Design a protein around this ligand. Structure first.
Ligand SMILES: OC[C@H]1O[C@@H](O[C@H]2[C@H](O)[C@@H](O)[C@H](O[C@H]3[C@H](O)[C@@H](O)[C@H](O[C@H]4[C@H](O)[C@@H](O)[C@H](O[C@H]5[C@H](O)[C@@H](O)[C@H](O[C@H]6[C@H](O)[C@@H](O)[C@H](O)O[C@@H]6CO)O[C@@H]5CO)O[C@@H]4CO)O[C@@H]3CO)O[C@@H]2CO)[C@H](O)[C@@H](O)[C@@H]1O
Length: 202
């Protein structure tokens, strides 16, 4: 649904290659089109990875939800400086906006990043390029599926130890669509590409 609100500007800088913004992006977007949302809209990092089409005075740009703006109220987006300048005048400081969460945006294949410090005793998984909100991330334990806990920093963590060897991970989005990612390695910090998609390329 269309949310009507306002926008201020801030920056995540050049960032690092580990964690950028509250969603813990592996990198600050090269196009510098990102946004921090209010705490209720952040929804415990459930909005991480999703994209917003934000309509401003000078048009409409697409930005990736990347961070949590604790000081922002509902409807108040904290845009990147580049996204702000493209929508309105930078000297204005505040601009009137309206935005929607993009449903199934065109993007690359799903990628999984195992967090630093992850072992068989404890592991954190980050799902990338899913396109939409993710409701469920599970690791295969024998013939059953061990559900992971959604953290408020963009990762999914194990509530209990997992088996050794390659990981078989099932990810389910907000639309009930699920993909299974076999052969995932316990490699902390690495972005593991896949050939899986929640929706086809057209
Ligand atoms: O990006 C901007 C935002 O940043 C947020 O801050 C984040 C931060 O970026 C992020 O890095 C951080 O992530 C940390 C997790 O929160 C934390 O839980 C995690 O701790 C792990 C640890 O990495 C892991 O090594 C450890 O494994 C233990 C295991 O627990 C223990 O059971 C096991 O013991 C077994 C023995 O090894 C075994 O011999 C014996 O037989 O059995 C034992 C068990 O019975 O030992 C292993 C180690 O070998 O587990 C812990 C968790 O329990 O570390 C992460 C970092 O690496 O999270 C931050 C958020 O909380 C800001 O908060 C936000 O404001 C910014 O916007």
């Amino acid at each position: 649904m269309t949310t009507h609100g306002r926008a201020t500007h801030y920056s995540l800088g050049q960032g690092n290659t580990i964690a950028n913004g509250n969603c813990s992006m592996p990198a600050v977007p090269a196009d510098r089109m990102y946004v921090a949302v209010s705490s209720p809209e952040y929804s415990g990092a459930a909005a991480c990875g999703t994209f917003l089409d934000v309509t401003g005075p000078k048009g409409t740009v697409r930005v990736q939800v990347a961070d949590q703006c604790h000081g922002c109220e509902v409807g108040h987006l904290n845009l990147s400086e580049e996204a702000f300048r493209a929508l309105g005048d930078f000297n204005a400081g505040i601009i009137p906006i309206s935005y929607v969460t993009v449903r199934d945006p065109a993007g690359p294949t799903v990628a999984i990043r195992v967090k630093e410090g992850s072992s068989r005793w404890w592991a954190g998984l980050q799902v990338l390029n899913a396109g939409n909100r993710i409701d469920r991330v599970e690791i295969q334990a024998g013939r059953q599926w061990l559900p992971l806990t959604r953290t408020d920093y963009g990762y999914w963590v194990t509530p209990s130890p997992i088996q050794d060897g390659p990981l078989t991970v099932k990810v389910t989005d907000q639309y009930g669509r699920a993909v299974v990612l076999p052969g995932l390695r316990m490699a902390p910090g690495e972005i593991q590409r896949t050939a899986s998609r929640f929706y086809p390329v057209h």
